[PDB]
Design a protein around this ligand. Structure first.
Ligand SMILES: N[C@@H](Cc1c[nH]c[nH+]1)C(=O)O
Ligand SMILES: N[C@@H](Cc1c[nH]c[nH+]1)C(=O)O
Ligand SMILES: N[C@@H](Cc1c[nH]c[nH+]1)C(=O)O
Ligand SMILES: N[C@@H](Cc1c[nH]c[nH+]1)C(=O)O
Ligand SMILES: N[C@@H](Cc1c[nH]c[nH+]1)C(=O)O
Ligand SMILES: N[C@@H](Cc1c[nH]c[nH+]1)C(=O)O
Ligand SMILES: [Zn+2]
Ligand SMILES: [Zn+2]
Ligand SMILES: [Zn+2]
Ligand SMILES: [Zn+2]
Ligand SMILES: [Zn+2]
Ligand SMILES: [Zn+2]
Lengths: 142, 143, 139, 142, 143, 143
């Protein structure tokens, strides 16, 4: 399994809801931090893609490391969208802080890099004030 | 709006993720409940939670109103865990899950009433040994 | 165009809510089924429509149409995930299946409507609310 | 328990299916009816929100009652959309009427107010005539 | 049941896969149609297929019946392509597809009437140049 | 992008829809695997395929990494087969499938590594077999 004190999701989460970047970077973690506000999902997917190539998290060349992040993002959007992966076209909108990790979370080195996308903030109507919290975490091999 | 000290999702999740705790949250005006469930049946996960939340009186043991908000909240969170098909065993996967239910008012205006949050953390994977990754789910509903 | 006097959905639903159509063009059946299993709800509907003359007992064409229309109806009932006991909820349903042509165009042929009405909730009565679904297909 | 003389779903569906006399107002029900045609699901949501707010079905102030109605409409749209909550985006359009009811349908007054969203009308191709009926009913506590 | 040579599903997929049979299909009694379409909108794909299917007389241009069948068989085929959420552009992705639409009776029993298959093949990936893997999708309806 | 005459989907698919030729694929860089499963449980379909890809050389039997890709590539292929709800028996339908599994690199450079393709073909229909129609699904993941 994974290590009792280096569980990548639990980290990516504990970080996102606590103001950090430094202690984690000192271990194997290629970390990334973010914020997107949109009523389009294709917007959130694009932001995350950029911040991930922009900081050290994902190789900008090729499809491989990309394809990992796309599906890891979808997955996180699930917890967020809770059933239909739609925002504005369902008359809703999001204020999100995204956190993204990469490193090996398992005991054996043969396990390679794994990517975690965490998403936290709020979902509600286009008019600010009308919202509750939302939450999505996704995990893929990279 | 959501008052920054009382972000109900955030509190409930922080609670689950930290080994160390409840007693502090009760003092502020929070009904609280924790537990564990491991299963290949999503129904056992729902049931354990409906159970824990009633024995420890986060919601009433009788009536329907409160059971309904909790059902829909659990359903919501199980979205995080399952990511597209709310199935475990029938898609050959299983979960080892801690959960928290957290009840109070996260809104500045005290005429917003109570709200419920249900959070789920643990692993999801194949039935074999340690063939799994982490998994997570939060669901919020007016109660 | 839908012939406003003969709307196969509206009719099938009104039927479920009340406690005739055969003399107009309609083939009609009604039934009851309570389950923690969706497959049984599907099966009860299939069986009841075959016992009466709503869809022919033989071949696949008419069965396939009833299959899908039932599914579409279950979408109304289940509201995101087409699962019952499997998510610790349960159903007590009446159903109707109507068949006949709702369009002016007599070219349009027979259509099917599958309507589902009842309650969905916890295993325990009263810990439940109402539930509805309609599925419409060509046949 | 649900009392046969007051099934909120049943009533809203009956009202919507007939052709003006109120007398549902005569008991404790708050009610409205509407018409809306769109190829946009968000427009449908907005209409029903607006119409319930421009009468006194749900309060225009605060998040709670907006939230319940939001969700009831989402549920209701399931029956209508049957799998993907997409309209013009999947090349289809709706002609709907709708009714929203709010009241205590349970014997025990402890149950408080519940809401029901009913939708009836057509779904078909962007041309009128190429369409069939469609129905969604959502029920939530409020 | 279906026969070994007149299995509509496969034939229609197989047709798409050899860039090389259309006439060979027609001498048998299949009514068939080949196409290509690229887009970031799901609706465009449906349109492409609806149009080509009416223009070359796979289905009646007049009336609803045959349209309704087509629509749902396309709906089905798009699940394979889209694998969970039936969005393209609105979920940051786009498609290049050939499509085939086949009509006739894949059964001994001739009282089954006509059935219809819609097969889609191309790729899927980002709007960007060359980020793409393959994609697939078959829908089957009575017609 | 892709090398045009080693497109992993079409290969596995042509492979699957064609009743030796394994060896042809094997003689290039392909790890390749075939098999058959009929079930009213999706989990049996996933399981058969995990086992067949492990018994042959197709994926490493030790660890999680390769299983997670194969798990997911399968989910994706079953989306094609099942079309909205990834349920068989609990929706009173059943499958008789045949499956192909391909592994290797089908892109320009070899920095792209291995990718996997799980391709499904067969029928779906009522628990009384015979009353059926065809089915198809293709899942593509990196490995
Ligand atoms: N737009 C929704 C936001 C939402 C609630 N639940 C999930 N999303 C609202 O108006 O509240
Ligand atoms: N049985 C699956 C469970 C799973 C993986 N990813 C998401 N769920 C597995 O092989 O791990
Ligand atoms: N278990 C839920 C069932 C349900 C509510 N809404 C839809 N289904 C309940 O007990 O009410
Ligand atoms: N766009 C579809 C409408 C539809 C049928 N079923 C659900 N929607 C049509 O052209 O008929
Ligand atoms: N945005 C994704 C699209 C996708 C991957 N898998 C399914 N869809 C990509 O870069 O290819
Ligand atoms: N049980 C369905 C199976 C099915 C048909 N189409 C999709 N699934 C049937 O009777 O054929
Ligand atoms: Zn992909
Ligand atoms: Zn909500
Ligand atoms: Zn079918
Ligand atoms: Zn409910
Ligand atoms: Zn339709
Ligand atoms: Zn996974």
């Amino acid at each position: 399994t994974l290590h009792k004190e280096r569980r990548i999701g639990r980290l990516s989460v504990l970080l996102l809801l606590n103001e950090q970047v430094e202690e984690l970077e000192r271990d194997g973690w290629k970390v990334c931090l973010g914020k997107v506000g949109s009523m389009d999902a294709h917007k959130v997917i694009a932001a995350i893609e950029t911040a991930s190539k922009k900081s050290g998290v994902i190789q900008s060349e090729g499809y491989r490391e990309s394809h990992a992040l796309y599906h890891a993002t979808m997955e996180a959007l699930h917890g967020v969208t809770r059933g239909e992966m739609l925002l504005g076209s369902l008359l809703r909108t999001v204020g999100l802080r995204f956190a993204v990790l990469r490193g090996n979370p398992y005991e054996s080195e043969a396990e390679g890099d794994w990517i975690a996308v965490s998403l936290y903030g709020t979902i509600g109507a286009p008019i600010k004030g009308l919202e509750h919290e939302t939450f999505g975490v996704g995990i893929n091999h990279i």
